[PDB]
Design a protein around this ligand. Structure first.
Ligand SMILES: Cc1cc2nc3c(=O)[nH]c(=O)nc-3n(C[C@H](O)[C@H](O)[C@H](O)COP(=O)(O)OP(=O)(O)OC[C@H]3O[C@@H](n4cnc5c(N)ncnc54)[C@H](O)[C@@H]3O)c2cc1C
Ligand SMILES: Cc1cc2nc3c(=O)[nH]c(=O)nc-3n(C[C@H](O)[C@H](O)[C@H](O)COP(=O)(O)OP(=O)(O)OC[C@H]3O[C@@H](n4cnc5c(N)ncnc54)[C@H](O)[C@@H]3O)c2cc1C
Ligand SMILES: CC(C)(COP(=O)(O)OP(=O)(O)OC[C@H]1O[C@@H](n2cnc3c(N)ncnc32)[C@H](O)[C@@H]1OP(=O)(O)O)[C@@H](O)C(=O)NCCC(=O)NCCS
Ligand SMILES: CC(C)(COP(=O)(O)OP(=O)(O)OC[C@H]1O[C@@H](n2cnc3c(N)ncnc32)[C@H](O)[C@@H]1OP(=O)(O)O)[C@@H](O)C(=O)NCCC(=O)NCCS
Ligand SMILES: [Cl-]
Ligand SMILES: [Cl-]
Lengths: 565, 565
């Protein structure tokens, strides 16, 4: 009989306990959870706050009792592991109900303690109106402040998925909200020009979005005066729990009834550092492909561990649920001696931003330049399904690739429909090792309500392949303001379109008149073309190079350029 | 100048015309179309009938004048090519206005004449109330008979995708509909147990669905009595364009005001036969992977041609638009000497069936059985996204595979949401050569409005892999009604579920009471287990097999079983 101990009872740990039982009826399996619940839906938390998930019960998927009855796993809630004594193969456990302590032995241990919200060195940030969100109790504390302090304005710090989901929820409740992000964008897995779509959706919701802005100080002021009907004052706009006064990195003041801190999570490494387990250079527990720590009897999974990046093989931190469930499953396997290797993380993710979804997988352009990896990029703006059918929405899609070998580095997409499907297709093609040239041959579902004869993904593969083969010559949005004297900017859109915007200094020849008016264009200038989304631009470009011009086409067209600034 | 001639100005021909122009400004390009429209949305026609697509102009994507302005292609509408003289490189062309003819020389010809609806040898089939649907004038004639003959009841023959779309579209106009199909199922790309979900959806809408049944005779009866208000009669339910009396294959009479024939299409091969071009055994034009016919100067693309099945590499006929459009473009590359090879057809398809979508890629189990290829299947019935999030729907998913090599032969999926996404991911996985064991490491997008932490596809990969590894032992819906004396049937649902249907003779032990009650099961029999969807069944199976019983779990559970009859 192996005795298996599991630390943490949610995505990594609960996943390991269940698989471990299916693998062996003779193992004793004990699972410790310092909180009151196991198997709850962390991802549900922001949606219960807005009432979108109306029922609290929907957030709890198993109980200690249901884990005993189904899996004969002893789940101990309110029991926090406080030490691991490796040589003795004993853990010390604390019963949070009374503070008493006991020890328990293991043959093998799995650590899945997750990652804790990041506490920023901001004076005053510890106070009755400031909260992070990790679990059900942090959610109740948020819900309680909202009710009790009559919250009418809230501020969210941080523009990753947790902070956008909080921003969205609080907006759902009619709360006026301010989002502060220190970066120049929300959602760092996408690149800044892709984020410009979400920035405008956020601003059209009346949210006060402050990018490039840090929170420097928090001042909490207790309310000393309770207004009352009996004293004939208005009480509707009163805050009995107090007031926050925020000082920002530019000395401006923000007044707020509630502050959500959502600036990232840090792996839970204290048990593991106290036990002498190796920690990586990002601050996560270090594990081999088999998710074994520096002690071969101890395994670790999920948001506490560093993972290998699929694309680069380098270490990364990717706190998502998919990888933690599949890791917990595979450490159970390994713990019965199956030697299964985890295959690295692409960091496939997707976040709801009001009516938009913003998706990415693999590496973005900031991560590629930083590691010195040479790359090329394309943009398409193509209907989510046959345009002539109702409800079609523009998907803006970025593909990043090796301009020689055609390796896929990453893909990003933003828009109001079909985003999860395009990201999921690129995730599988990258994982399977397909090159951009091979992407051209994908054979995806087409009927008018669901797709289009040539998909979003096929169009992107043709535009990228045309670059790789020398059939297209690109210029990008960040190059096109900076033209030299042997370049002539040509706009191939129709004249009426120019009023929504265009570029300073452009000659206008509409694409469908170009073949005839082309002698107006001198052959001793490189002609720098642009259209609305890049498509008519390519047609023109082809016409020109077929006639001996030197030319470039603006990838993603004016649309990309416009959301890039 | 190369002189390029193109027969057919829609999906194959038009794609090849536009590509060919991007390839060369000097090439003379002439494209003949026997009808009045080029580049029209064939797929949109049933949708404009219903009024789902409100304006006829949405079905027309180019015009001869747009094709000449943008691409300098001379489109000749109402010109029909009536012969090819290959040895002289001349086609004979008929002007359908006049009946006059001429010749036109070519350097290279492309045939993309499509496929014609199949004409059944039924007596009486040719009459004014019976119509098939290939193009805009077909569509207009159906609309005309609808309005003129005050259609209140119609009959559709054929349960393929066009027949299904026309049934929905008629239902949508308030027209009572009967669907007749000779096979035992609608939508033959999917297996009969998957189409059972579609049968229920269609019946639920009050459509009269008759599987297994052919049309034997049609009788058209012209109307001699026009009811009038002046003679004080009810004019409301009259049909001045007459009446159809249909005789069915089992003797029954069916009376209807309109008959729609959608029994499939047949490649247009007459021109290719008269010219001596090779024709394959399925009756389509025979091409190599460069799209070239038996004459090197003559290419052929689209519905008129036989393609190469991705999975087996034998011949098939797949009349679908994505392949047509990518074949056309590659043919034009080949005409300029680029020697590109098409990579075979997976048959990826999806059809909207009322609220349901039914999709497939690859080979089905009928087709694998016919070719004598050894396979295995799994079913899963998994929420389309996190089910604690509103809107989740059940995706019923079938994976066909090689039970020893893990090769992916095909996948099928039915449900009200997320179908296009799951079939797309499978088409990508199969195309890139992943095996079922590799599917388990797919990292798909997860946020609650869009997926779940383990996607539908991961769940199906785990269940197939358990079977390959020997960790699961399947029984299927069509074996479970048998059962020898060495076998015992165990339902592991909860007692209240047995009220919604069960399997006669089951012993019921709920899985959550099974570890304590297991001694009730004798160990000298194989315990044949079922739960609702297969999931609790697997938990059970593992407990028994870990205690030294012989057992099998029913794959897809009672749900797959139920929809199989
Ligand atoms: C609001 C929110 C929304 C999210 N949305 C998504 C999403 O949409 N998509 C997605 O992929 N991911 C999302 N995530 C992330 C996903 O929840 C995590 O990546 C995943 O839960 C990590 O699993 P884990 O097992 O590593 O850690 P956790 O799920 O954090 O589980 C760790 C458990 O260990 C317990 N514990 C820690 N130390 C001890 C100890 N010493 N003794 C006993 N118990 C201990 C903790 O209390 C915790 O309950 C979201 C997270 C949050 C907070
Ligand atoms: C109602 C309907 C709905 C459909 N829905 C879908 C769907 O949802 N998804 C999907 O993938 N596919 C769908 N299809 C199929 C798809 O439209 C076809 O696969 C694609 O059109 C075939 O392209 P093609 O170029 O081979 O044929 P076509 O589009 O049929 O074009 C051939 C053209 O050649 C012309 N022609 C023939 N002979 C001559 C001649 N001798 N001279 C001059 N002209 C000639 C014909 O008039 C015709 O216009 C649908 C088809 C129909 C009819
Ligand atoms: C649910 C949870 C308790 C684990 O239980 P689990 O039994 O391993 O998981 P599932 O219910 O997903 O079932 C998976 C098993 O069922 C099997 N299965 C799934 N569908 C099946 C079907 N229809 N038929 C037969 N077997 C099936 C799978 O193969 C797998 O078993 P295996 O691992 O032995 O191959 C756990 O992962 C969890 O606590 N997660 C919720 C919390 C969380 O993830 N939070 C993160 C952010 S939201
Ligand atoms: C549209 C049609 C005329 C062909 O036009 P086309 O110019 O080849 O096709 P598209 O608009 O799809 O453009 C594809 C081209 O633009 C390029 N492109 C697409 N988006 C781009 C972008 N944003 N930037 C740069 N280039 C882009 C692609 O690379 C491709 O050019 P390439 O083939 O030389 O690589 C033709 O397919 C047709 O008549 N279809 C309607 C009929 C039909 O298909 N119906 C069947 C059932 S609905
Ligand atoms: Cl454009
Ligand atoms: Cl079940």
């Amino acid at each position: 009989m192996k005795k298996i101990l599991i630390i943490g009872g949610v995505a990594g740990g609960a996943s390991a306990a269940a698989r471990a039982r299916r693998l062996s009826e003779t193992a004793e399996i004990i699972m410790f959870e310092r909180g009151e619940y196991v198997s709850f839906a962390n991802s549900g938390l922001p949606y219960h706050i807005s009432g979108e998930i109306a029922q609290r019960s929907a957030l709890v998927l198993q109980t200690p009792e249901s884990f005993k009855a189904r899996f004969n796993v002893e789940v101990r809630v309110k029991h926090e592991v406080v030490a691991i004594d490796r040589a003795a193969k004993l853990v010390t456990v604390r019963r949070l109900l009374d503070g008493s302590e006991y020890q328990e032995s293991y043959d093998t241990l799995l650590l899945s303690p997750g990652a804790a919200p990041i506490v920023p060195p901001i004076p005053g940030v510890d106070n009755p109106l400031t909260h992070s969100l990790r679990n059900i109790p942090d959610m109740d504390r948020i819900l309680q402040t909202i009710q009790m302090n009559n919250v009418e304005h809230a501020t969210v710090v941080g523009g990753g998925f947790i902070g956008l989901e909080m921003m969205e929820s609080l907006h759902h409740l009619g709360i006026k909200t301010t989002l502060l992000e220190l970066a120049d964008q929300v959602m760092t897995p996408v690149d800044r020009e892709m984020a410009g779509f979400a920035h405008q959706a956020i601003r059209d919701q009346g949210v006060d979005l402050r990018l490039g802005t840090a929170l420097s100080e928090v001042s909490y002021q207790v309310q000393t005066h309770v207004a009352s009907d009996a004293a004939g004052e208005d009480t509707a706009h009163q805050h009995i729990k107090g007031h926050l006064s925020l000082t920002l990195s530019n000395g401006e003041l923000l007044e707020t009834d509630l502050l959500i801190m959502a600036i990232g999570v840090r792996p839970e490494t204290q048990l593991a550092r106290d036990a002498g387990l190796a920690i990586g250079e990002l601050g996560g527990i270090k594990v081999n492909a088999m998710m074994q720590t520096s002690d071969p009897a101890i395994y670790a999974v999920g948001d506490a561990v560093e993972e290998q990046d699929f694309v680069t093989g380098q270490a990364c931190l990717v706190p998502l649920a998919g990888p933690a469930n599949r890791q917990g499953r595979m450490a159970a396997d390994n713990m019965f001696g199956r030697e299964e290797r985890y295959q690295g993380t692409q960091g496939t993710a997707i976040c709801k931003v009001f009516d938009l979804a913003v998706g990415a997988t693999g590496k973005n352009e900031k991560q590629l330049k930083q590691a010195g990896i040479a790359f090329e990029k394309v943009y398409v703006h193509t209907a989510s399904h046959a345009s002539y059918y109702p409800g079609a929405e523009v998907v803006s899609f970025k593909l990043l690739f090796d301009p020689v070998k055609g390796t896929i580095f990453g893909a990003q997409a933003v828009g109001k429909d079909g985003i999860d499907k395009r990201i999921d297709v690129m995730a599988v093609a990258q994982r399977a090792g397909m090159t951009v040239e091979q992407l051209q041959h994908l054979e995806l579902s087409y009927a008018p309500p669901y797709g289009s004869a040539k998909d979003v993904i096929n169009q992107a593969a043709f535009v990228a392949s045309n670059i790789i083969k020398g059939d297209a010559t690109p210029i990008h949005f960040d190059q096109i303001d900076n033209l030299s004297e042997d370049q002539l900017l040509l706009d191939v859109r129709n004249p009426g379109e120019l009023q929504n915007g265009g570029l300073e200094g452009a000659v206008n020849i509409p694409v469908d008149e170009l073949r005839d008016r082309m002698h107006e264009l001198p052959k001793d200038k490189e002609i720098i073309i642009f259209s609305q989304v890049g498509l008519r631009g390519n047609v023109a470009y082809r016409q020109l190079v077929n006639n001996g011009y030197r030319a470039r086409n603006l990838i993603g067209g004016y649309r990309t350029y416009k959301f890039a600034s």
